[PDB]
Structures are given as C-alpha cells and as structure tokens.
Give the backbone structure.
Amino acid sequence: PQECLLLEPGLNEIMANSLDYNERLWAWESWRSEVGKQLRPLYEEYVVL
Amino acid sequence: NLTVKLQLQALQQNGSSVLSEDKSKRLNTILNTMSTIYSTGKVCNPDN
Ligand SMILES: *[C@@H]1O[C@H](CO)[C@@H](O[C@@H]2O[C@H](CO)[C@@H](O)[C@H](O)[C@H]2NC(C)=O)[C@H](O)[C@H]1NC(C)=O
Ligand SMILES: *[C@@H]1O[C@H](CO)[C@@H](O[C@@H]2O[C@H](CO)[C@@H](O)[C@H](O)[C@H]2NC(C)=O)[C@H](O)[C@H]1NC(C)=O
C-alpha cells in the first residue's frame, strides 16, 4: 500500500499497454471504487444548482 | 593473555550467516520491508 498511482502517468498506461486480465481488472475497478465514490455526493448536488 | 583473548573473541563470532541461505535471504528481506514500511508509511484525513 505504499505504491499509490495517479491516473495520468501510470494508470492509463497500465490500461493502454498491459495484457494481463487481472491487472486490467484491478485498475478498472479500483479507479471507480476509490475516486468515483467521492464524486457521487458532489454530482448529485451539482445537478440541482 | 586477556588482550589477545578479547580480540580473538570479538573476531570469532559467527553472528549471522550461521543460518541457511534460504533463511538468511528471508531474514534480510523482512528487515528491509519493515524499515521501508516505517519510513514511507502515510496516513490521511477521513474527509479529504
Ligand atoms: C600479553 O600480556 C602482557 C601482560 O599481561 C602484555 O605485556 C605488555 O606489553 C606492552 C607492550 O606490548 C608493555 O608496554 C606492557 O608494559 C606489558 N605489560 C606488562 C604487565 O609487562 C603483552 O603485550 C600481551 N601480549 C600482546 C601481544 O600484547
Ligand atoms: C562458527 O560457525 C561454524 C559453522 O559455520 C561453527 O562450526 C565449526 O566450523 C569450523 C570451521 O568450518 C569447523 O572446523 C568445526 O568443526 C565446526 N564445528 C564445531 C567447532 O563444533 C563454529 O563452531 C562457529 N564458531 C563459533 C565461535 O560460533
């Protein structure tokens, strides 16, 4: 857990180069489960305004 | 002689390397793992 990646230089590089089903799945799932879950209560409030 | 006995005793000690090679590598790995975890561990806020 001391190896945290950002999206730009390093996640969409895994997604663009790799061929390991499990590695792609880990990346795709974690990006949505760790960042997508913070944007929901903000998007629900942005829609109204 | 006490002096030469002291020197030879300081020099003779096996220390590590009395283990197997598997075991010694396994030990040197967890030492570095623990040191690195301590040196670069991070905690962050519950809200941001
Ligand atoms: C063995 O022990 C003797 C004394 O127990 C040491 O003798 C000393 O030697 C130094 C020079 O090397 C002298 O300046 C001292 O005065 C000596 N001490 C006595 C009480 O005479 C001897 O050095 C020891 N062995 C080695 C190799 O150092
Ligand atoms: C240091 O470790 C060695 C093994 O790596 C111990 O075993 C002795 O090693 C010497 C040198 O190969 C042999 O001649 C002896 O037959 C070995 N067995 C003995 C002495 O029982 C050695 O005893 C260790 N020494 C210390 C001071 O721990």
